[PDB]
Design a protein around this ligand. Sequence first.
Ligand code: HEM
Ligand code: HEM
Lengths: 146, 146
Amino acid sequence: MLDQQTINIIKATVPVLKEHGVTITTTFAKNLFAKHPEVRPLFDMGRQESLEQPKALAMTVLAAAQNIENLPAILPAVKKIAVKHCQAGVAAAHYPIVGQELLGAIKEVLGDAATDDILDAWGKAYGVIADVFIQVEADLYAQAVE
Amino acid sequence: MLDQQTINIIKATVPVLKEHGVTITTTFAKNLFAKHPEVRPLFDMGRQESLEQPKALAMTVLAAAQNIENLPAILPAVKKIAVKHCQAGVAAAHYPIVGQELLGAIKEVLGDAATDDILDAWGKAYGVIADVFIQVEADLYAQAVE
Ligand code: HEM
Ligand code: HEM
């Protein structure tokens, strides 16, 4: 769970990230497929627009973060994505890889505007968001096997 | 995390529980020490007022639940309690025992006013609250050993 100070940092910086949003998500997607090529097969690798799915991944993290004090209002969105995640075989162990690369992309694009304090706050926000997905997906996986 | 429907149930029933608050917490305390006598030594078993600590335990759960959509505002209270929990040697495995007995006490006192749907919602709220304590305490324990 986030403390108020961390929430305030997210609130203050979400608009900076969104101003650079296409560049962050595009950098994330490129870095993810270049540094972790093992995740490529899980996505649709159509020749031209092969970055659109991982760009939307990163963009949705940013959108969930801007909504971090009302995650219950977006739980129905989280559940729809979870079904797709479970059908693609996304595992809890994938989530730290994605978080690492997203934080890396934010620093790569924002430069000195992404301080250690700001990156730490985004890291904590990502963890809270990921934990919701992991739990929903764990339950869905358990329903399908029992 | 709670969904909105569950949050609404907690919001609607917290005042019913508080109207019976002394009776719920007293019943919880008696049942806890009678059905799980192994937890007795962790508390202060002074002759007369030996129920005041576990009554305050239950009352604070109810207070956290009424604040379940702003847990960040009570995190400083959670941290102070966590230090006491860690000094008493409270373990993650204690939390389902306490939740079981608190839900049992709520049903015992409220009777037919505590429906299955209401009890299920209080069970989910307890889990979210306990998870915050467990995480804070896990970190504190790790600081003291490393
Ligand atoms: C951390 C929070 C995450 C969020 C908010 C999120 C969000 C999304 C969204 C919105 C989509 C739909 C994309 C679209 O159809 O346009 C998606 C799809 C997908 N994501 Fe996630 N994701 C997260 C984590 C992950 C992780 C850790 C992986 C692991 C590789 C992952 C892999 C996938 C895959 C394989 C798809 C399938 C594409 C599709 O069917 O649309 N996602 N994710
Ligand atoms: C589930 C959420 C819980 C909450 C909100 C909570 C709350 C509290 C509070 C407010 C106190 C201080 C009591 C006072 O001094 O008046 C306390 C103390 C204590 N609680 Fe917890 N508690 C929880 C879980 C537990 C659990 C699972 C145990 C396991 C047995 C536990 C055992 C203790 C003990 C041994 C004390 C020491 C009494 C003291 O130093 O005051 N608590 N708890």
